[PDB]
């Protein structure tokens, strides 16, 4: 209800303020490097990121209006997509590389250190390339990330309240683009371009899980997984 009264500038302000921090990995450049150890680092990182994501989600306008049940479902559905879009965002200024952490920058080399992760790696790289090409803005990014949270589990009422919040975020994206000087035609085109990328992010998340079920996992990650 508080979400529906926000102006677009206030929505952007709220999302920006809610942003989680960028976490460090335990990567040691001296330390030698195994399939298991690489996955170990990433698992350690993702697990800590999940904690922040959970508390970030509570700050996404509209999210606290849902039952504990529905909050759990949305996060279970979206968490990998959300980690992935975060990764693609912070990797934008690093062509050909993925910035998993400020002290963990990899190209598709040691992505092959894990069986099949190279496939996901290339897809993540392509997404980062696409964001870079479009010159994706921070304000646009936080909008997209919130959309993923609200949308990915929505098709498995408060489902309509979620659609109204989603509509608000759409309004906010358009407002941002109008301010950047885009013509109305250019606004609709860019909006579509951004949302179609969300189909690819869903694709990447699904392919990731499939490879997973084909690694060490924290108890929190395990709870999330056998939600898929």
């Amino acid at each position: 209800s508080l979400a529906l009264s926000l102006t677009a500038d206030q929505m952007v302000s709220a999302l920006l303020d809610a942003e989680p921090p960028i976490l460090y990995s335990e990567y040691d450049p001296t330390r030698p490097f195994s399939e298991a150890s690489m996955m170990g680092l990433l698992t350690n990182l993702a697990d800590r990121e999940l904690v922040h994501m959970i508390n970030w989600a509570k700050r996404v306008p509209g999210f606290v209006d849902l039952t504990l049940h529905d909050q759990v479902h949305l996060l279970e559905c979206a968490w990998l997509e959300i980690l992935m879009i975060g990764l693609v965002w912070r990797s934008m200024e690093h062509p050909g590389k993925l910035l998993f952490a400020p002290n963990l920058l990899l190209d598709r080399n040691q992505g092959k250190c894990v069986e099949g992760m190279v496939e996901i790696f290339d897809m993540l790289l392509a997404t980062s390339s696409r964001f870079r090409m479009m010159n994706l803005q921070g304000e646009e990014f936080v909008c997209l990330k919130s959309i993923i949270l609200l949308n990915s589990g929505v098709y498995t009422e408060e489902k309509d309240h979620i659609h109204r919040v989603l509509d608000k975020i759409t309004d906010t994206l358009i407002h941002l683009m109008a301010k950047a000087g885009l013509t109305l035609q250019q606004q609709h085109q860019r909006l579509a371009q951004l949302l179609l990328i969300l189909s690819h992010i869903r694709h990447m998340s699904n392919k990731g899980m499939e490879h997973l079920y084909s690694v060490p996992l924290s108890d929190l990650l395990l709870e999330m997984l056998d939600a898929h």
């Binding site: 959970i54 504990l68 759990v72 929190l220």
Partner: peptide
């Protein structure tokens, strides 16, 4: 579920 404790905290 740990997710509950973190969501409820």
């Amino acid at each position: 579920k740990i997710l509950h404790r973190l969501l409820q905290d």
